[PDB]
Amino acid sequence: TGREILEKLERREFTREVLKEALSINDRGFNEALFKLADEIRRKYVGDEVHIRAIIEFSNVCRKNCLYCGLRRDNKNLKRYRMTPEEIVERARLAVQFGAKTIVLQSGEDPYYMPDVISDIVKEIKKMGVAVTLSLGEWPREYYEKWKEAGADRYLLRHETANPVLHRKLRPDTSFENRLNCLLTLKELGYETGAGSMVGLPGQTIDDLVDDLLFLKEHDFDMVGIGPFIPHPDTPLANEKKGDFTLTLKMVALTRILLPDSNIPATTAMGTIVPGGREITLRCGANVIMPNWTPSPYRQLYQLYPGKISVFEKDTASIPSVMKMIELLGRKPGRDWGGRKRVFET
Ligand SMILES: C[C@H](CCC(=O)NCCC[N+](C)(C)CCCS(=O)(=O)[O-])[C@H]1CC[C@H]2[C@@H]3[C@H](O)C[C@@H]4C[C@H](O)CC[C@]4(C)[C@H]3C[C@H](O)[C@]12C
Ligand SMILES: C[C@H](CCC(=O)NCCC[N+](C)(C)CCCS(=O)(=O)[O-])[C@H]1CC[C@H]2[C@@H]3[C@H](O)C[C@@H]4C[C@H](O)CC[C@]4(C)[C@H]3C[C@H](O)[C@]12C
Ligand SMILES: Nc1ncnc2c1ncn2[C@@H]1O[C@H](CSC[C@H](N)C(=O)O)[C@@H](O)[C@H]1O
Ligand code: MET
Ligand SMILES: [Cl-]
Ligand SMILES: [Cl-]
């Protein structure tokens, strides 16, 4: 019974078996109750503020060849770009002028910047009195250390899949063990650290999803980014099935139940597969939103997956749009940098 599973989640009985059954039950009434539980937990622990992280995707150059990603090195049907350090800093300034209190710098694994150009950019943005989050991939400890000394606050490095076999197959340059080592290094260096995974990868099972949830709970991540897999036509996975929105939403809800004081975005991928999908996600456990702040003409060239919603609008439209979203949801914008506010419990 769904009722029994809900009771067990409510009492914090987070066994493998409970999680598996929650993900396996397809009943509408159960799912809606699960979503309501996560929404309530979100409200009680992290409140009504929705934190805005403005993302600048500053280079689509990548040395890796992940099978799912549109930026993989083997994709020749992509115009590659690099923003200059001045462009990046001034674009960050504009986001701060528009009210962003975190700047996220994301790129492919592009050697050109690493480490010192990033450090210089980070230092310049930090003068603006905002949080800086980096999402640059896997690099040596030394690079992560340099970026932390330069002032970076947070680092996003999704674990992608906690199944090491599937991880190696989908990310043939690397391994789950290296991904985890990177995440542990970032935690040690004092970053607020984000992990997370895709849902509906080819070959991924429900037990794999359970393992993702248990992995997240084990390491107590500050942020967890979850979205559906969306096949990209210029990759080896072009003909595979999209991830299911409802199942992905259940993963967000369960993440909030498991990690009640974490920061959890309503990802752009959720809003790509279903119209209004970010808004739904913000009502099922999420409390962060990441408006795209990549300028034209580059924005349209950073498509990890196709259909990305933000590609066609004026490049200053996203921050105002998310502020409207937050209001029509009956929520409030974040007042501070939206760092993790731990609630210690039992
Ligand atoms: C807006 C729609 C449709 C509601 C509706 O239209 N239902 C009939 C009329 C009800 N009214 C009270 C408006 C009038 C009753 C008098 S009447 O004469 O119309 O029957 C309702 C139906 C199911 C609801 C979702 C689920 O819960 C799961 C989840 C819980 C979270 O916490 C918040 C998010 C989420 C996704 C919910 C959002 C929203 O809330 C939904 C879509
Ligand atoms: C960038 C330009 C020119 C002036 C400028 O460079 N302004 C820097 C402001 C810096 N901050 C945001 C940190 C101020 C916070 C003050 S606050 O009192 O909100 O704490 C200013 C002039 C008018 C400002 C918009 C409007 O206002 C409406 C709206 C208010 C929301 O709220 C934030 C979003 C939005 C769209 C604003 C964005 C931006 O800002 C605008 C475009
Ligand atoms: N085809 C793919 N489908 C779905 N996701 C993919 C894909 N390709 C890489 N991603 C994901 O995007 C993450 C970067 S942040 C994405 C952002 N929040 C957004 O939703 O746009 C990577 O770590 C992957 O999990
Ligand atoms: C653009 S994909 C996300 C950033 C980084 N390349 C990573 O795979 O973690
Ligand atoms: Cl962040
Ligand atoms: Cl994310």
UniProtKB/Swiss-Prot annotation:
InterPro entries in UniProt: Aldolase_TIM (IPR013785), BATS_dom (IPR010722), Elp3/MiaA/NifB-like_rSAM (IPR006638), FeFe-hyd_HydE_rSAM (IPR024021), HydE/PylB-like (IPR034422), rSAM (IPR007197)
EC number(s) from the headed UniProt entry: 1.8.-.-
Cofactor detail note: Binds 1 [4Fe-4S] cluster. The cluster is coordinated with 3 cysteines and an exchangeable S-adenosyl-L-methionine.
GO biological process, one term: water-soluble vitamin biosynthetic process
SUPFAM superfamilies hit by this protein: Radical SAM enzymes
Superkingdom, natural source: Bacteria
Residues given in the record as [4Fe-4S] cluster binding sites: 62, 66, 69
CDD domains per the UniProt record, alphabetical: Radical_SAM
Ranges for domain Radical SAM core: 48-267
Effect of mutating residue 62 to A: Eliminates binding of one iron-sulfur cluster
SMART domains according to UniProt: BATS (SM00876), Elp3 (SM00729)
GO molecular function: 2 iron, 2 sulfur cluster binding; 4 iron, 4 sulfur cluster binding; metal ion binding; oxidoreductase activity; transferase activity
Necessary cofactors: [4Fe-4S] cluster; [2Fe-2S] cluster
Subunit structure: Monomer.
Protein role: Required for the maturation of the [FeFe]-hydrogenase HydA. Catalyzes the reductive cleavage of S-adenosyl-L-methionine (in vitro), suggesting it may contribute to the biosynthesis of an essential sulfur-containing ligand that binds to the hydrogenase active site [2Fe-2S] cluster.
Protein name: [FeFe] hydrogenase maturase subunit HydE
